[PDB]
Design a protein around this ligand. Structure first.
Ligand SMILES: Nc1nc2c(ncn2[C@@H]2O[C@H](COP(=O)(O)OP(=O)(O)OP(=O)(O)O)[C@@H](O)[C@H]2O)c(=O)[nH]1
Ligand SMILES: O=C(O)c1ncccc1S
Ligand SMILES: [Mn+2]
Ligand SMILES: [Mn+2]
Ligand SMILES: [Mn+2]
Ligand code: NA
Length: 614
């Protein structure tokens, strides 16, 4: 862009650019960079090119400073340990700004909305002014041009993220497609403006904990969809600071999707091939901590079946002119929960993460390896453990429960051959599910599209234990009014040509009276996928129940599993389901209230009626 006029010398930041050129940026990109440089007052501006050289030297620099540590047991892997105050998404500090609250969340009948957190324009302006002015003093502002989705995909969207965090730059290189080719692709087109600061201008006003810059007290993750802006302050945790990951991927994108006729969802996408050489793509929405990444990367136990991964967390889906629901993974890597990852639960992740991977908040072994609860593999005698709190550790956990790996998707040994195809992959089934220790069978199939949207809406999951509502696995992620999101989903049925995928609901987590899992899960979930596959093909493998279709007796391949109690696992109790429908009723009435579509109320009535006839 052109240099700003000025009567002095404070508006043109060209002299502070240490990589790239403001003159070579598209005009609106310059305005965005320079405007926020004027506000935040960085010492330098670094326009990222996405090169390996850039990445390597950035990592070595963070290593110099003791912000990250190299994990010498592996190939170009690194470890970051955070301030324990900055370890996860903070829902109560995550907001969406719109002129009217109702555009962001439905106005609940009696209670406080659980479906979003609206902040008024006025309150945000005040919050912004109390945080950003001068916030990058002494620091580099990195400019990260990135694509969500394969570059030039009709489904891809571009952002520009400004950050003062080299951790964010590195992790964004993994999780998005970033650098100079994106700027060239963008040209004078539209982009999402993403502004991030850790909120710790130099000289530091407060002590740095574990060399991890953050400002917990002023942490605020804001989304301004009508301005195409994401503005995040105070947190370096990836869900808050890698603005592609959730802010763009789900919150802003779900609104774009609403406006433009597509869907942005908290879904893995996998391809599954059967022993007759037929392949189908499925998407699945489970809440956080409910096993999407395991499913997405599944190593199936059934001989002759293959699973390949398109993505593990976000799906952007659009019906094409032929009526196929075409999906892309708009991400470039996996940002996956480390604890519980083992050769038993996710052998393909174990494979993936030993090269070119950044770990955050896991334990470190004395030989430069990684450790966490549930890794389920022993250390040689001699090898010792430093916890994620940077203390010597022996059996508090050694790793934070939301510690994660950040790894390139291209390295997954079962990455799908079409995982970067710009036209996307055709989704033939959508799976919902969560943690239900009681009452909910292993798998059922919705009766219709409308029933299936109700099934998404009615999702609940265990957090004494609390069973929480998490509709579509989107509860913390809706970019706009959920009622209107339901209507948008329902509207897909009225597209002539649309080939509506079959909708299923699974429960890997049903327990017997002793608290033991009824179902072995993991690779054994391939048997559930086989049933779904056949159902999509039209097989006569279902029996009707009040909640939807379930597998016929003998329909599920249980060879290996005579130990498994199909009776308790597929049991449907009138008493449980009477209570279930009442809770769903109460929830939807309060939380969706005047914006609850007729079709969803109708499905509630119908389920009530079917249960009444038991
Ligand atoms: N019993 C059982 N537990 C499973 C299964 N699949 C995954 N899990 C559990 O799910 C948890 C791991 O899931 P996460 O990686 O936290 O889930 P996610 O959906 O990818 O979460 P986000 O990345 O936060 O969106 C661990 O507690 C696993 O043991 C299964 O088939 N059976
Ligand atoms: O909480 C989430 O679902 C999540 N998922 C993937 C990666 C990061 C986060 S914050
Ligand atoms: Mn997630
Ligand atoms: Mn995951
Ligand atoms: Mn309808
Ligand atoms: Na640290």
């Amino acid at each position: 862009g052109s240099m700003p006029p000025q009567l002095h010398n404070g508006l043109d930041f060209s002299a502070k650019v240490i990589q790239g050129s403001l003159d070579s940026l598209p005009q609106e990109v310059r305005k965005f960079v320079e405007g926020n440089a004027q506000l935040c007052q960085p010492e330098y501006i670094h326009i990222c090119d996405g090169s390996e050289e850039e990445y390597g030297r950035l990592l070595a620099h963070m290593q110099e400073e003791g912000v990250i540590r190299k994990l010498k047991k592996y190939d170009n892997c690194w470890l970051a340990l955070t301030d324990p105050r900055d370890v996860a998404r903070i829902e109560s500090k995550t907001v969406i700004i719109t002129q009217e609250q109702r555009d962001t969340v439905p106005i609940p009948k009696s209670g406080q909305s659980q479906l979003g957190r609206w902040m008024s324009e006025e309150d945000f302006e005040k919050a912004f002014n109390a945080r950003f002015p001068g916030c990058m003093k002494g620091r580099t502002m990195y400019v990260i041009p990135f694509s969500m989705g394969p570059l030039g995909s009709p489904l891809a969207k571009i952002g520009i993220e400004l950050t003062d965090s080299p951790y964010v730059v590195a992790s964004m290189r993994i999780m998005t497609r970033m650098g100079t080719s994106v700027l060239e692709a963008l040209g004078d087109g539209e982009f999402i403006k993403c502004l991030h600061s850790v909120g710790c201008p130099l000289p530091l006003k407060k002590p740095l904990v574990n060399n991890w810059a953050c400002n917990p007290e002023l942490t605020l993750i804001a989304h301004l969809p009508d301005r195409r802006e994401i503005i995040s302050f105070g947190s370096g945790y990836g869900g808050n600071s890698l603005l592609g990951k959730k802010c763009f991927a789900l919150r802003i994108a779900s609104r774009l999707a609403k406006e433009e006729g597509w869907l942005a969802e908290h879904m893995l996408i996998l391809g599954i091939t059967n022993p007759e050489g037929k392949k189908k793509y499925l998407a699945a929405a489970f809440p956080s901590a409910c096993g999407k990444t395991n499913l997405a990367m599944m190593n199936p136990t059934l001989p002759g079946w293959k699973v390949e991964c398109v993505g593990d967390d976000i799906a952007w889906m659009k019906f094409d002119a032929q009526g196929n629901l075409r999906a892309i993974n708009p991400e470039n890597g996996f940002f996956g929960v480390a604890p519980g990852t083992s050769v038993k639960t996710n052998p393909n992740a174990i494979k993936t993460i030993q090269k070119n991977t950044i770990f955050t908040n896991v334990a470190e072994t004395s030989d430069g390896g990684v450790y966490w609860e549930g890794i389920d593999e022993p250390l040689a005698p001699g090898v010792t453990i430093t916890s994620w709190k940077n203390k010597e550790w022996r059996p508090e956990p050694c790793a934070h429960p939301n510690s994660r790996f950040c790894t390139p998707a291209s390295q997954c040994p079962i990455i799908d051959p079409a995982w970067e195809s710009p036209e996307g992959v055709p989704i033939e089934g959508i799976i919902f599910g969560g943690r239900r220790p009681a009452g909910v069978p292993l798998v059922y199939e919705a009766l219709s599209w409308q029933h299936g949207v109700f099934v998404g809406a009615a999702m609940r999951s265990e957090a004494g234990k609390v069973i929480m509502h998490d509709p579509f696995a989107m509860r913390p992620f809706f970019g706009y009014n959920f009622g209107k999101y339901l209507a948008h989903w329902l509207s897909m049925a009225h597209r002539p040509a649309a080939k509506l995928p079959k909708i299923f609901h699974v429960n890997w987590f049903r327990k017997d009276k002793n608290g033991k899992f009824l179902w072995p899960g993991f690779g054994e979930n391939s048997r559930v996928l086989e049933w779904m596959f056949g159902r999509i093909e039209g097989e006569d493998s279902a029996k009707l129940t009040p909640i939807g279709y379930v597998p016929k007796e003998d329909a599920l391949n249980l060879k290996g599993l005579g130990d498994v109690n199909v009776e308790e696992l597929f049991g449907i109790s009138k008493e449980f389901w009477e209570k279930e429908v009442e809770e769903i009723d109460k929830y939807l009435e309060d939380q969706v209230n005047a914006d609850l579509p007729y079709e969803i109320e109708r499905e509630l009535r119908a389920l009530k009626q079917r249960i009444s006839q038991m």
